[PDB]
């Protein structure tokens, strides 16, 4: 997250860190047994870590659980990143508490203008590499589809939305990938892609979760 702030330990209790020997992507807990992340974060051998704040120190509120299965969206296109969402089932159900909680899926989509909270342990430098150990947060509004499409002509589909600042300076970045974009209490987006990070007129692009609620509900009930 570039231009964000330190969230504070466990202030984003539905945030997960996907680890395959090191943190490589974020995710969101939707119920005690399932996590939603991005399909471009797909790997074999994933351990999900809940209750994290400093991912390099065992501070006492973590739960490390292995995934039993991953389901990448059936229509995910790795070239365009369209339908960039994946579901991960945990081997054991997580114990939910104040520090580990699930986020709700949306009943409708959110309007341009709505402020959201984006978080993750991704890169914090636009030009450079600096990876934080504690969770970083960023509040950004959803941008109109028109400014999103002008920034990325022919690359935006109806399953994506941009959020951010056109002036640059604040954005999610690699490492934040798969993470949550929560607006008004609902998980509205998944950190998906962008052109570098925090560049002027290059906002972040997020998977539009409201278009996948029936697929998610059906998939988890049948697995
Ligand atoms: N080595 C790894 N463990 C790793 C993990 C995730 C990655 N994801 C990318 C990316 O290159 O695919 C990537 N994910 C992005 C998310 C947001 C923005 C943005 N808002 N500017 C840009 C991004 N670039 N490379 C990655 C490398
Ligand atoms: Ca920790
Ligand atoms: Mg994240
Ligand atoms: Zn990138
Ligand atoms: Zn990359
Ligand atoms: Zn990524």
């Amino acid at each position: 997250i570039v231009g964000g702030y330190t969230c504070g330990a466990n202030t984003v209790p539905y945030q997960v860190s996907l680890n395959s020997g090191y943190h490589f992507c974020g995710g969101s807990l939707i119920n005690s047994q399932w996590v939603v992340s991005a399909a471009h974060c797909y790997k074999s051998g994933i351990q999900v870590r809940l209750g994290e704040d400093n991912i390099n120190v065992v501070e006492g509120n973590e739960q490390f659980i292995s995934a039993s299965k991953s389901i990448v969206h059936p229509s995910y296109n790795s070239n365009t990143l369209n339908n960039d969402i994946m579901l991960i089932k945990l081997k054991s159900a997580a114990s939910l508490n104040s520090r580990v909680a699930s986020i709700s899926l949306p009943t409708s989509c959110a309007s341009a203008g709505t402020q959201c909270l984006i978080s993750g342990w991704g890169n914090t430098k636009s030009s450079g590499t600096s990876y934080p150990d504690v969770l970083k947060c960023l509040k950004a509004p959803i941008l109109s589809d028109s400014s999103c499409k002008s920034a990325y002509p022919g690359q935006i589909t109806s399953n994506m939305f941009c959020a951010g600042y056109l002036e640059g300076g604040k954005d999610s970045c690699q490492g934040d990938s798969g993470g949550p974009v929560v607006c008004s209490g609902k998980l509205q987006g998944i950190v998906s892609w962008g052109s570098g990070c925090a560049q002027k007129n290059k906002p972040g692009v997020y998977t539009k979760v409201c278009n996948y609620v029936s697929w998610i509900k059906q998939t988890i009930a049948s697995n």
Side-chain angles (χ1 to χ4, degrees):
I1 296 287
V2 181
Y5 55 94
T6 302
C7 306
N10 311 113
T11 48
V12 188
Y14 49 79
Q15 172 84 232
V16 321
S17 166
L18 303 188
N19 183 294
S20 50
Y22 47 87
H23 163 87
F24 66 91
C25 275
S28 293
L29 186 71
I30 49 170
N31 73 204
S32 75
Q33 298 180 280
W34 293 90
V35 170
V36 57
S37 181
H40 77 272
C41 284
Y42 168 79
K43 258 184 192 159
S44 300
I46 295 170
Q47 184 189 54
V48 172
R49 294 180 171 220
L50 317 174
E52 289 278 27
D53 181 33
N54 183 316
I55 49 176
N56 267 331
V57 180
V58 173
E59 292 177 289
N61 302 110
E62 307 88 340
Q63 289 185 57
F64 295 166
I65 300 167
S66 288
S68 44
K69 67 188 310 173
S70 299
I71 304 166
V72 166
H73 190 269
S75 310
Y76 167 67
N77 187 319
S78 67
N79 279 136
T80 58
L81 286 220
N82 187 32
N83 302 302
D84 186 22
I85 181 169
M86 158 184 77
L87 284 179
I88 298 164
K89 188 179 194 183
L90 300 181
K91 269 194 59 164
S92 300
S95 298
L96 307 179
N97 56 64
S98 332
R99 302 185 175 243
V100 178
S102 51
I103 182 63
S104 317
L105 286 186
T107 27
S108 47
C109 299
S111 338
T114 296
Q115 290 290 327
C116 305
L117 178 65
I118 309 171
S119 53
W121 290 276
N123 191 19
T124 56
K125 296 285 168 280
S126 4
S127 315
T129 303
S130 205
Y131 279 90
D133 286 316
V134 296
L135 208 39
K136 297 290 191 164
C137 282
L138 170 72
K139 286 171 164 78
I142 290 178
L143 303 179
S144 57
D145 282 305
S146 34
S147 61
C148 187
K149 287 168 180 169
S150 309
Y152 299 104
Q155 298 189 291
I156 304 304
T157 63
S158 51
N159 301 315
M160 307 172 180
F161 69 85
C162 295
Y165 299 94
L166 291 184
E167 43 276 298
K170 293 152 240 82
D171 195 7
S172 51
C173 187
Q174 38 186 54
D176 291 326
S177 312
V181 178
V182 175
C183 327
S184 299
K186 321 285 158 167
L187 179 67
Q188 291 286 175
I190 296 179
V191 180
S192 185
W193 55 282
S195 187
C197 305
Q199 294 297 293
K200 176 182 182 180
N201 290 307
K202 289 295 170 184
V205 190
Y206 306 84
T207 302
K208 192 176 197 187
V209 184
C210 58
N211 287 358
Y212 304 96
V213 176
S214 56
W215 173 68
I216 290 173
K217 291 191 170 180
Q218 188 147 38
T219 295
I220 66 173
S222 313
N223 286 280

